[PDB]
């Protein structure tokens, strides 16, 4: 009969499995399980991690006086920078915990896992005789995750600037990023917000219109209703066109917001409009942009308590 490898590849590329173990799956599964195990173990119990590199650690574990909301896997120490820090490179396991190795391990394995997950999506699309562009749509959250966890640390030169793996870590990262880069004033963040809001709007509208038209496959009456409502007759009367638009809007929005993130990773901030409206004499008149500037200034002074030692934050 067939050799061992033939049987193995028949089993791997089999659509009869409960979960498709693709050729991308053979890498996706171990990386994702390793990342999940390390993340769970670190979240449940892990010693404080010296994120700032100034010999003061912060605790983010449940066994160290934290809860679900404030728990996080602290990013890698600033002293490490961008250096590769595996377990075998540390003198002792406790040193690896202190310097913040688990964050790096989880981030690497998780990025590999999501890339292989997109690959597996394409693979199972191929094996079932479908058009293979679901992975293209899925790339937008993948791109956003890569920009959050990888591109921004590369641009800023350290892994300590990456997103912490925790709920409060997300808010801290967002406040930091708005303080240092003015995320809200960037056109790409505006496009991302527009994409998200439009995705919610179109989801609600499509759901309501289709459900209402599913009387005892969508009929043409829903198109007439929509045309009467917002005075946009013939805007969307083809079901394929409507569903393609539904797919295209949020994906493009997320692509553009991820690109804006990666752009700021290289210190290309958003719009600056402070000190723009000026009196005839020369005095400066405040504008809502100036109030945003004041809030950013307040965020910046308390950014790092004892990390900086020079007037300008070049890092």
């Amino acid at each position: 009969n067939s050799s061992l490898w033939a049987r193995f590849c028949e089993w791997i590329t089999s659509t009869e499995n409960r979960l498709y173990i693709g050729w991308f799956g053979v890498i996706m599964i171990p990386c994702l399980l390793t990342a999940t195990s390390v993340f769970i173990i670190a979240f449940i119990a892990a010693p404080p991690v010296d994120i700032d590199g100034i010999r003061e650690p912060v605790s983010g574990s449940l066994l160290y006086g934290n809860n679900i909301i404030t728990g996080a896997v602290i990013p890698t120490s600033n002293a490490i920078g961008l250096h590769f820090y595996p377990i075998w490179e540390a003198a002792s396991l406790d040193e690896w915990l202190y310097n913040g190795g688990p964050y790096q391990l989880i981030v690497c394995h998780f990025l590999l896992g999501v890339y292989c997950y997109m690959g597996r999506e394409w693979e199972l699309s191929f094996r079932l005789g479908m058009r293979p562009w679901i992975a293209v749509a899925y790339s937008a959250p993948v791109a956003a995750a890569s920009a959050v966890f990888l591109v921004y640390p590369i641009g800023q030169g350290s892994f300590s600037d990456g997103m912490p793996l925790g709920i409060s870590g997300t808010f801290n990262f967002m406040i930091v990023f708005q303080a240092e880069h003015n995320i809200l004033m960037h056109p790409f963040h505006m496009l991302g917000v527009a994409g998200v809001f439009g995705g919610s709007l179109f989801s609600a509208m499509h759901g309501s219109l289709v459900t209402s038209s599913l009387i005892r496959y969508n009929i043409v009456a829903a198109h007439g209703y929509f045309g009467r409502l917002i005075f946009q007759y013939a805007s969307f009367n083809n079901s394929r066109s409507l569903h393609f638009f539904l797919a295209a809007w949020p994906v493009i929005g997320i692509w553009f917001t991820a690109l804006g993130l990666s752009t700021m990773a290289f210190n290309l901030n958003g719009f600056n409009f402070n000190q723009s409206v000026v009196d005839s004499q020369g005095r400066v008149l405040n504008t809502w942009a100036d109030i945003i500037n004041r809030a950013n200034l307040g965020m910046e002074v308390m950014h790092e308590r004892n990390a900086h030692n020079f007037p300008l934050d070049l890092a």
Binding site: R18, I44, L62, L63, N67, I68
Partner: peptide, 30 residues
């Protein structure tokens, strides 16, 4: 104590996810 409660809640949620994925109602006449 509270850490044990959080761990129990997370473990229960993961178990529910596992049961839903595997011990699901077979879909017929899609």
């Amino acid at each position: 104590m509270e850490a044990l409660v959080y761990t129990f809640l997370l473990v229960g949620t993961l178990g529910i996810i596992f049961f839903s994925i595997f011990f699901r109602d077979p879909p017929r006449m899609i």
